[model samples]
Every structure is written in C-alpha cells, then in structure tokens.
Target: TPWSKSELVRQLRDLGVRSGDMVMPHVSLRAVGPLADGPQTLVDALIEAVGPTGNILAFVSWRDSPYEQTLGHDAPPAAIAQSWPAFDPDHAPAYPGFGAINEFIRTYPGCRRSAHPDASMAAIGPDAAWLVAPHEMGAAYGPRSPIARFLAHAGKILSIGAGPDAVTALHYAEAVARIEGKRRVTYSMPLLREGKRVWVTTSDWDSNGILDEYAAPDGPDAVERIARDYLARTRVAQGPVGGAQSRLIDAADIVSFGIEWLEARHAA
Candidate 1:
C-alpha cells in the first residue's frame, strides 16, 4: 500500500514527535518510500505532525556557496572583489546536501529563511521568526545558530532516514565546548547593506571537517559511536518510518552528552 500523508503523520507521532514541539528534522525523501502525494505530502505530514502550535526547522544552506569562488586555503584579493551576489532570503536556492525535504520547507508558504547565505535555515510556525532571526554571519553553527536557539527552547532533533552525521545539534556541542584543533575557514559573501550589495568577509568552524583530524583508534565513526553509545545508555525513541529507520532525540540531551564526549576525547 502506498503511504499517505496521514500515515506519515501517525508514524511521526509514533516516533515521539508531539504537538507544540520545536523540531529540526533532517530527512531523505526517497528513503521514506513513495508518498501518495509525493514529497509535498511528506512535508505536509511533518507540519501536521507538530500541529498548529508546533514549529519545524531545517538547514537550508545554499547549493553553490560564495566560499566556493575562493580556490584555496585563502581567497585572493581579486576573488573577494568579485564576490557573488548578496544572499536573497526569498530567492536563493536551497543546499542540495540538506535534501528535498529541506527545500520543500524553504519554499513552503509562511516559511521564513535565515539571512545568512552559506548556512541559512528555514522555519515555520509560532517560533519561526525567533528560530531564524539571529543567524550571525560568523557563527554559522555556533552559539547564535538556530541549533542554539532550538536548545534554548528545549527542542528536538528529528532524523528520518538520516544518520548521526545529519544530527547538526552535535555541531552546537562543538561550538559550546570550543573544541581545540577544530578547523576554521574564512571567505567572503555579498550581503545587502544599506540597500546595496556589500561584500563581507566572515569565518566559521569547518563543520564538515571539525572531527576529521580526530579519526584514530576510535576510527572515523566518532559521531556514530557517540550517538550509538548515548542511545545505549539513554532513551531515544526510535522506530520505522516508511522505508527508513527514524529517531527523535532530545536537543539538550544530545548536545550535553556530545559536549562531554568531545571534551573528554579532545580535551584542552
């Protein structure tokens, strides 16, 4: 039988999503199998799962980042001079890495996207404005990021056919711990200033490679290890949603445990 929108909503509730919850979900639409109404139905199911009072957020970064123009460890003066156009909150394309579900939410009616270009996020519901309002250019995944606000509000991380790597709340943990040896990169992007395109140079932790150097006796499974180990000791509601295994984890708990894990493993 083909999956319906209501069935998806039911699965979400079974996975521990509740009305009025603030959820930042990372999903793989294809992994969810065939939806009767397609990806939009899945998106609708998510919104319906949380109901009118709840909020849904997802990372909606740009597909072609302004940083890409810079060819090496550093951007030449000329590249900065010819920076990409300012990030248009309403029109900029969604990052492909975030998947189709993220793009759906980004283009959804009443949904609002953050101002930052490379690391913007999209949200909808009562907390939409607050969730995406303070996305500072420098702290892409730091204290001022949406994950931080999600933690402050006691939010949840929803993983649908996604894995530990997709659990960006852990990045929030890295920022909190200020883990030593974390890589940093600086680049320039255009941002509208005083109604004109102004090139702005910014820097942030290389989120993708933050733990690359730590691959060791622990191996490259650090993230999975941390998540699996925590799940073994703690309670994270898990079940099957469509064709994929899913989990609903508490935002604060994951960040707290992640902080301890990073600090213990990569201490100062």
Candidate 2:
C-alpha cells in the first residue's frame, strides 16, 4: 500500500521509533517506492515520530566536494584546485549519492550540519547541538564522532527501504572493532579557513569497506554481512513501508554486536 505521512508514522512507531528517541536512518526512495507527499512526508513523519526532542541524523557530506578531484586518475592541477570554494556548511546541499532524503533534511529549516567536510553529518531536532559540533577531520567516525555520540543517547538505526547493509553506524563499529588490518584512505577536502578554502588532508578507516575479506573490494558489502548476522540473531524490528522492507535496530546494541562480530569473523 502507498503510505501517507501519518501512516508512515504508524509503521515507524511499530518499529519502536518515537518521541524523544534519536534515530539515525538511511532511506532509499526507490525502495520505499512512493508516499502521499513524496520524500518530504517521510521527513515530516520522522519529525513527528521523534517530536521536538528526538533527532533524525543522516550522512550529509557535500555534493560538490573537491575531494573527488583528489581521487580521479587525472588529478586536476593545484591552481585549478585552489580556485575551488571551501565547504560552506550553511548553504551547501547534501551529497546526492546518499539519497534525496539527506538533501531534504539539509534543506529543512533548523537542521544542524556538522563541519567535517568528508565525514560531515546532519541532524534535525533540538538534540542536534553536540552531535553536529566540529569534529576531528581525520578521525571523523571514531570516538568523538556523531555516530559515537548517537550511542550515548541509545539511538536507533533505521533502514527504511535501504539495503540489508545500509548501516553507517558500522563504521563506528569498525573504529572500535578489535581488528588488526583495517584498511584506510587519505584524501584532501577544502575546509573554510579564516576567510578562504584550504585543502585539508585527512584519513580514516575506509568508508566503503574496512575488512579485506568482503571488500566491495572492502566496504559496505562486508558491513552488510555484519548487519545480516545481527538481524538474524537479535531483536530488530522488520516490516514493510510502501514497497520496501524496512528495519529498525538499536544503535548501541548492534554496534556492540558488530564489534564482536567483526573481531570474530576476521583475522587479527
């Protein structure tokens, strides 16, 4: 059945997301299929479910990041790179590949966006303060990152029509997972300096996949496996939203399980 904002709220609540509860969600519009009011209604439904206190978080990195320039086989010249603008958090749109919902959240009035460029995230609610605070650019998803902060609030990770492995929280799991050969990547992004863009070099555990065994050549494909293992053994809420099968799992619970899962499955 196609859903409305209120109807989605019902589904969301059945999944245990509600008032004053922070939720980190990854939404795939194609999977969700359709809604009465499209993506905005999903955002409205989420804000309503969480009410004024609870927050909705997303990976809201930049859409036009020059960091992409650094990774191309034909890396652009320095002067051309120098002309690129620094991150303008207040006005920049969210990365499109993460999906359109992120851009919806980014455009929403009162949304709070973090300043870490590549690792930047966004929050929609009163609790957005510390979660969007300036964080270490290199160690963006580790101890002091927003995903780590999400655990302190007993946040929920919701996969709304997303794939079986659409879990960014797992990166924090990778940070804490006791694995020896975690793969990493170093790249440069332009950050707002005193009054200009400065190319900042930073590194962290690879975002795609960290474990060598199941690498998407080593990324989310492996993270997806960890998610399935947890979903199989734990008490996650799984149901349908429009055309997509959706799920809601406790952030702290899965990350802990993921830590142990990652360590046990992979060689140290």
Candidate 3:
C-alpha cells in the first residue's frame, strides 16, 4: 500500500529530516509487504515528501551478491545496485553504466543512487565538502569510496532493518583504519560494458572476526544474544526497515564516535 504523500511527509518530519537535509534511503522495497499496491508510487511519494530542497542518496542495485563473491572486486558502493550496470562480469576493463540506471537520477535530481562513477555517492549538495578518505590508494578503483568518506564525516548514522551485522557504516569504520595508517587492502576485478570490459582495483575488508568478537556476545548462547544486542544497539529490528526503522544516536554514542573519529583523523 502506498502511503499518502502527507503520510510520508509526516514520517520524514518525525525522523528530523527537513527540506534541507541529506537523506540516504537504504530501502528494501519488497520488505514493505502486500499492503503496498506498488513500490514505485512510494518512491515517488518519498521524493515529494523530501521536496526539492532535500537531497537524497539511494542504493538502487540488486546484485545482492557482492562483486567479490561473484567476480573479484570487493563490494564497491556502486556494485550492489543493479543500476550500476556494466557489460559483463567476466570481461576486464569494463565500461560502467552501459546499461545503468542513470535515467533514474537524471529524471529525479533530488534522488540519486550511490553507484555513480568514482563512487560519488558521498557527494551531497554542490557546496557540501567532498568526502575524502585514503582507502583506495593507487589501485584500480583507488580513492573512489567517496560514500565511505561521507560516512566518516557523518555526525549521525541511522541503520534500519540492518544490524551491526549489516553495518554499511563499517565502511566509515574502515576509514578510521586509514586514519590510523594501517594496511589499506584492495583487489582487482573486471566489469563488462557494451561488448567490452574494464578492470579496476578496489577496497576490501574482512569482518568475520569483528562479528565473532565485538558484535556477538561472550555467553552460552552468544550468537543470537549478540545479534539481538547489535540490533537493539543499532536500532535494527523486525523484517522491513525503511521510514520506520531509523536508529537514534544517543548522547554517549555520538560523543564516543566523534572522539574516535578525531583520534583516527589526527593519527592519520
């Protein structure tokens, strides 16, 4: 069931999202269930609710399988969106967006997905500071994790249906590593275009250990316990997270996160 434009506007207002805010909707359209007559209607309503003054960054890819799992590059912000469009996964030197969803953004300037070339997802308004980070240091997609750069600068992060398990915010956390001058790792992969392919090196990270140690509890039934804890801590609950599932950063968490960011930044 599509929400009334008024209903959606009220929802955005509840999240403290105003006309001038930057909203990145990490939506699972299908998760909304049968009540919705159509998802596209809701997308349109959201755009209207956010209005012209608001800027939206969305993830419109459907390749659930990260590129590394299928091809060989880690999950590029642009890779997950089906809209990221390339010719073939097996071809090297792939040309991006030969069949991309650029049309979606061109049609709706207030709404743009995160898979823009060179990872321009972090970009907000023209006057917004360019998100800067050193994750991609001289590789194929070197220095292209612009969204991760934005995550680093984000004063607040909201996770909906995702837990620390589904922490896209980890990209920002990894940026913390870069500030610390740690080993920045990346790999090479190819994407196909119109009868051609292109290869690029991109950033990659392993977090299985983080899951076992930090997110999961140290108890008899630690895994689920930890998952629940992560969910509660990150404000992730239930099946479908959208306008209903945003997380709030309590005073302590915000303070601590800022301290950590500053420490990492100065350490850089």
Candidate 4:
C-alpha cells in the first residue's frame, strides 16, 4: 500500500522529529515511494509532523537568474547585462530542478520567502518571518542566512529520501569553516531596491570550483562522508520513512563536526 500522510507523520516521529522542533528538510518524493495523493500529501505530513508552533524550511533558489545565465561562458556584454530581470518573490516560480516538494511549499498559503533573488529560501509556520525575513545576498549560506538561524534555534536537518547530496546545511559548514585556499565568485542580478528594480552584485564561496583544491572531496561528496561519520560516531538516528530511508540530524552537531573534519583534512 502507498504511504498515507498519517503514516508518514508517524514515521517522521519515529525518526525523532518532534512537535515544536524547527526543521530544514531536503526531500526526494520519488525516492520516498508512492504517495496517496501527491506532493501536497507529503507537505501536509511535514507540517503536521512539526505542528503549528514549529517551522518547515526548504531552499527555493531561482534557476534562470543572470548569475546562472552568464556563469560559464561570456555572452554579448550589453545583452548579458540587461538580460537579467528583477525577481518578484510572489510571482517568480521556484527552481524546477529543486523538485515539486519545494514548489508546493513556495506557493503554499501563509508561507514566506526570503528576498535574495538568486538563493532565496521559503518557510511556513510561526517562525517563518524571522527565519527568512532578511537573508543577506552575500551571505547566501553563511552566518547571515536562514541556515544560521536554524543553527541558532537548535533546529534539525531532516533528510527524507533526499540522501546526503541534498543536505544544504553543509554549505553553512563550508562558509563557517572557510576551507583553506577556497575561491570566491561574484555575480550580478536584478533585485528590488526601494521598490524599484536595480542591478546588484554579490559574492560567495565558489560552490564547485574549489573542491579539487581542497585535497579532499568537497560539495555533496564531502557532506556525505561527514554525515556518515557523524551518524557513526554519534547517536544520530536513521531509519525507513515510507519505502526509502531517512535521517534526523542535529544542525549544530553536524556543522560543528563538519568544520572540524574540514580543518583536519585540509588545514593549511
């Protein structure tokens, strides 16, 4: 039988998610098995698992921004410059590649999204306002981002059939650790400025370019290893949720362990 919303909620609780706990989850719907209805069922299950006071957060990045458009190759200079359009939080759709789960949350009633055009995230529940109110453009996944707030609130990172590759909290680790010899990239995008669209620039740690220089694996692979070690060395819980496996990890513990792992593996 396909998983029902209630069963999913029970599975989540068994995996350690509790009412009133703030959670940032990465989910792969297909991996989790057939749903009774669809993405809404899954989203409902998550919201139900966390309850009214708790919050649910997901990365709702924009895929076709100017930053991504001009990323790899140089295009006509003037055309490239003006090709970027201002992002409308209420209208701009969630990056499709992020999966249907995020799109549902992005459009769900009472959900709020951060203002960063290129790397915005969405949240639903009592803490939505504070969780995504003033996301810093330059600090996409760093000290000033929602992930930082999650860390501060003693939130949990829940991987629901999404696996380690989808764990974005590691970006926070990369930012906090400031891995030796890391490279930074700057990009421009049109954003709301005083209610008008204006061109703005922001820079962040190179997401993929610096991995080869780190001596150890970086990006998702690095995160996978760190998560594995964390689960093994610590008592973090993992088990089946639906037909696929899931994990519940403490945000603070993983970030701390990730930093130490990076420093020891790639210290200058």
Candidate 5:
C-alpha cells in the first residue's frame, strides 16, 4: 500500500529518529519506485521523522573524478559491470533532488552528508552525529574520515539493523583502538565528482587489487558479499567497548531511541 508522507514520517519517528539527532543514512533507491516528486517526498518524510529537532546524514556515492585521476579519463566502461537490471548510474540517487545531498544540507545546515565535507546542512543533531561518526578503526585514520570527525562528537548511534556490519559506528571504535598501538586498515579511492577528480585516503595499499576484484565478480551478490566483508573487517561497528550499544535494533527499538532522547532532553 502507498503510505502517506506523514505516515512514513510517523513510522520513522516510531523507530527513534528525533528532531535534532545526527544521522548517516545509506539508501537503495531501487527499493522505491519512481513517483511524482519521489525524491522530495522522501526528504520531507525524513524531516518529519526527526520532527523539528532531528537531523539526517546521508551519502550519495559519486565515484568518477577520482578514477580519472589514475585512469586519465572518465569511468571506463570496463570499470562498470552491468550485473543487475536496474543498474543505471544516470538515474541512480534520483538526481537533482538527491544528487549532492549538499542540497538538503544547504537548506538545513545542521544535517550533514558524511562523504561530502562542504555540503550544507542544519545544526548537527545527535542522530545525525551518530550516523556520521567514523566506524571501526577510524581514529587511527583521523582526517581520513572527515565526516566521521563530526560524528565522534555525537551522543548515540541508532542503526536500522542490529548487526555490526549494518552499523558503521564500529569503525570509529576500531580506529580509536588502532591508535593505541594496533594495526591500521584503509579504503579504496573512488571518484567523488563527474568531471573533477577526487578520492578519499585509505590505510590499505591493495585497494587497486580490491577494485579490480570487484570488477571481476560474476554476480551482484558476490560483489555485495565481498564489499560487506571488506566493510565488516575494515569499518562498521565500533570496538567491543561499545558492546551493549552494538546490538541491532528493530523498528520498535529505533522508535524508542528517538523518543528516549526527547524525553531525556525535556527532563534535562
């Protein structure tokens, strides 16, 4: 059934997104079909979900210009493997509306797009902070996760899935632990612009091989699993220090997290 915009917002609130929380949100738009003003509708719903106090942190993956830095041109056709029917980079992210994520940031300076440091957004809310923080092994690579830098200051993180892979906060923990005399890890350099060149620094040196390995996958699932494992080992869920906080939360739990913040804030 098609849900009312407000209904969706209510559901998100029910899951624990408050008015002023910082959030880091990764989305699969394919799950949502194209509708009239679809992107804007989602933005509105997210805003309402947080009520007036909460803020959202989102990522709009842009891997282009960075590749060009090494390849000497745009995204090579060979670089892209069409494994899924809905794979369309052009339509991806429901552009114009959800293109830069910075667009929303411009309107609400608090919220942030962790990937893009300069993006405009409203005041950094608690939920937003939690969402944007560096995951496992981030502190060792400070300035590496410029986005996570903001998140480190957040109150708490509320994740949709209970598992660590599903939650990125783990990387923050890992990063911190590594600095205390542990090893370091890194990420691949993906393009951040269409024509301009950009890339995020990674601790690992084998990212070239990792990139090629993904390009060599036979199925999307294979790629997803590989990426999942990579993130699991590298990012996501903080160290065991955040053990109790690491448990995955259901919709009900998430809703409670949001509500709890409000209750505490009011009491404070």
Candidate 6:
C-alpha cells in the first residue's frame, strides 16, 4: 500500500514527533514499502510533523571513505594513497549503507553538512546550520560531536522501520561510557589545507567495539542491546508509520541510559 504524505505526518504525530523538535531518524525506506505521492513524501511528511522550526538529521558518512585503506595493516602504497581525492562534502554521496534517506537529506535544498568525513551528518530546518557545525576531526562521536549538539538541542531518536542496530546517536554513549579498556582507533583522511591536499589523522573512541571484548558473544551488539534495554525499561511513543512500526525516543534518555548500561555491566 502506498502512503500519502499527510498520512505519514499523522502517523508520525501518533509516534510523538512534534513541531519544533530536533529529530534524528534511523529510517529504512524499503520498510515503508511504497508511497502514494513519491519517495519524497516521507521527507515532506517529516517536515510537516516537525513544522518549520524543527530540524531533521541524517548520518551522512562519506562514501569512498579511506579508513579501510588507511587503517589496515597492509596500508595502501604512499603514491596510490596520495592520489585519492579529498572528501568533498558538497559532491560526495553518503555511504550507501547509511540508507537512501541519508542521501535524500543531504541533497535536500539548502541543507548543510558537517565536516568530519567519517562521522558527517546533514540537517535541514531552522537549526540545521548550528547542529552540524564545528564537527571537528578528533572523536567524531565525542562530547563535542554533532549528535552531541543534537542532544544539547533536546534531540529525539525516531526509529522508523530500521533495525535497532542503526542508531547512530548511541555512538555518543560509546564515547563517554566509563567502562575501562574502551579502545580508541586512529585513521587518516584526506583534507584540503591552504589550497592543497593533506592527510589528517584522527583518533577517537572505537565506535565499532566499545566493550565488545566483554560483550556476550552471540546475542546482540552493544548498541542493539542497549536500545532493547532502553525500550524495555522506558515508555516511548510507539505506533505504525507508513507501512512499518516506529518508536520515538528522547536522545538524552537513551544515550545516558547506554552510558549507565556500560558502566554497570561492562566496567572492568
């Protein structure tokens, strides 16, 4: 069944999306199946649900990002590595695995994107510029990360038919969790310096494995487990949006909860 934009807005409202709210949605378009007006109807519906004052954020990690080549033991040869293009926020596509919605948000008119290639985000609305600015190199999901600002603005996490695993904001919890032996990783990316190209090295909390060393080997990953635990313990607005079920959760609530989850169970 195809959903009209208004219906999507109403469903979003039922799921607790509000006017002027800063929303970061981890969405899977295919999960919604189809739309009456067009694929863009989902984006338009989100806009109406949040009204003109609110902002929407998308995790726009750079495509063709170099962490794979730069961080591997068999690093790319110097010449080949140097020949790679610097990340161009204006032209690059979001890492495709981020979902079609990510590219949609980035290309939306007047949208602004943050700088960090590995942790880039795109936003639209009144707060778009401020939420993604100063996305400095180190600690992409650290205290001053873009999602951190999203939290400062009282952001909400909207999970619309996406897996509990795609929650990008939980990386903030991974960065600040007090668990001992939290590993950090260092990788290089190309950047422009004085009209020339340079490779910038950044070291931050290991987003891939905060405490995976101690985590249960089979059941779920840390972020997924934390999300389930948060959902289990809290009262979040839940309902169907388009063709799939969705949940709206307070960003601070879950990130803070994840921090506590780590400290209580994973601390060394």
lDDT (Cα, 0-100) at 134 in candidate 3:
31
Instruction: Mark the regions of model 5 whose C-alpha exceeds 4 Å error after superposition.
Output: 32-36, 68-147, 155-169, 177-268
TM per model?
0.91, 0.92, 0.52, 0.90, 0.43, 0.93
lDDT of 3: 0.38
Candidate 6 per-residue lDDT, tens place, 1-268, comes to 6899989998998888889999998887888879976668898898889999999988889887887677733444597466888878888889988778788779889889988888889999998888888888885987887899998889999998987777889889888887778877777777766767677876777667676563454536678888888888999888898888799989999998988988898745
Q: Which is the better candidate, 2 or 6, if ranked by TM-score? A: 6
By summed lDDT, the worst window of 10 consecutive residues in model 5 runs over 239-248
For model 2 the local lDDT of residue 245 reads 85
The alpha-carbon lDDT assigned to residue 31 of candidate 4 equals 85
TM-score comparison, 1 vs 5, better candidate: 1
Clashes of each: 0, 5, 19, 0, 55, 0
- Where model 2 places Cα greater than 4 Å from the true spot, the runs are 72-80, 217-220
Query: Which residue window of length 10 is worst by lDDT in model 2?
Result: 68-77
lDDT of 4 at 189: 67
lDDT of model 1, residue 183 = 65
Please write out the lDDT profile of model 2 over residues 102-203, one tens digit for every residue: 988888899998888877899988879788875667767778888888888888988988876678888888887778888777777777878777777766
Worst 10 residues of 4 by lDDT: 209-218
- Candidate 3, which ten residues in sequence have the lowest lDDT sum? 90-99
Model 6 pairs in collision? none
Candidate 5, residues 1-268, lDDT tens digits: the string is 4445665455556555566654554333343334235545556666666556665544343323222232332232333322212212232232232243324433454543343321212233455544443332222223345334434434334433233233332333333221222332343343335554343443421211222332343423222433344444433342211111221122222323323322332332
Per-model C-alpha RMSD: 2.6, 2.4, 8.8, 2.6, 12.9, 2.2
In candidate 1, the residue pairs with backbone N, CA or C atoms under 3 Å apart (3 or more residues apart, or in different chains) clash, namely: none
Q: How does model 5 score by TM-score?
A: 0.43
Ranking by lDDT: 6, 2, 1, 4, 3, 5
In candidate 4, how many clashes are counted? 0
Pairwise TM-score winner, candidates 2 and 4: 2
